[PDB]
Structure 1
Amino acid sequence: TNSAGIAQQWIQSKREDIVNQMTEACLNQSLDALLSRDLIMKEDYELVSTKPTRTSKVRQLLDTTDIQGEEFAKVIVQKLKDNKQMG
């Protein structure tokens, strides 16, 4: 609950960093594992994959991160730690 909420909160706590740190591949592989574990429907997936710029593709994931809770978010947190990108 708490650290579950903190997980997406930490995303929201450092969201400016995710605009900086997350690449397209850091995005698109993270788009993959969500679509792999089916944490996102494809209609929402097409929304992120059609935005023109990186930051436009970033924010659509990160807005969808908030509405989908912790398990959607924890893997993205795990993505940046499995990257060891440490942003």
Structure 2
Amino acid sequence: IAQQWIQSKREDIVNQMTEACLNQSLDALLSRDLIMKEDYELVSTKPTRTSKVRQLLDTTDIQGEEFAKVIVQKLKDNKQMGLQPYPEILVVSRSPSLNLLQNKS
């Protein structure tokens, strides 16, 4: 859901997130241990405001819903009205994804 949404409004998130929004999403990303210091410095070196958000979107390729929802959930605190239709946030309880069902014989 958020993995699809980040590819629907990719051109809106970069225009909505000025620069202070990126710094706040970055602190929140590291709180979930989803980004290593080795690549979290590569998003913080970018000398151009819009180019900062580019390296942030490059991590989303590996992350899927993680670096995606962080954007949708940051913009919620700033209530910019550009992206009111935000995606889901963690709706799984015990779906048939990892769960067992098979047995011997």
TM range (shorter): 0.7 to 0.9
The change in CA–CA distance for 1:86 and 1:42 in structure 2 (over 3 A counts) is farther
Rounded to whole Å, the distance in 2 between the matches of 1:42 and 1:9 is 27
CA offsets per residue over residues 19-58 of structure 1, 9 Å max, x none? 2110111111000100122221111111100011011111
- Tell whether the 8 Å contact from 1:8 to 1:69 is kept in structure 2 after alignment: yes
Alpha-carbon shift at residue 82 of structure 1 (Å): 2.9
Alpha-carbon shift at residue 85 of structure 1 (Å): 2.6
Q: Which has the larger radius of gyration?
A: 2
Which runs of 4 or more aligned residues in structure 1 lie more than 6 Å from their structure 2 counterparts after TM superposition?
none
Q: Unaligned stretches of 5+ in structure 2?
A: 83-105
Match of 1:17 in 2: 12
Rounded to whole Å, the distance in 2 between the matches of 1:8 and 1:81 is 17
Rounded to whole Å, the distance in 2 between the matches of 1:38 and 1:76 is 16
- Tell whether the 8 Å contact from 2:3 to 2:64 is kept in structure 1 after alignment: yes
Rounded to whole Å, the distance in 2 between the matches of 1:19 and 1:71 is 17
- Tell whether the 8 Å contact from 2:56 to 2:67 is kept in structure 1 after alignment: no
Q: Unaligned stretches of 5+ in structure 1?
A: 1-5
Say how many residue pairs are matched: 82
Alpha-carbon shift at residue 65 of structure 1 (Å): 1.4
TM-score w.r.t. the length of structure 1 is 0.80
RMSD of Structure 2 on Structure 1 (CA): 1.6
Alpha-carbon shift at residue 9 of structure 1 (Å): 2.0
Identity %: 100
Rounded to whole Å, the distance in 2 between the matches of 1:24 and 1:75 is 14
3-state DSSP of counterpart to 1:80: helix
Greater helix share, structure number = 1
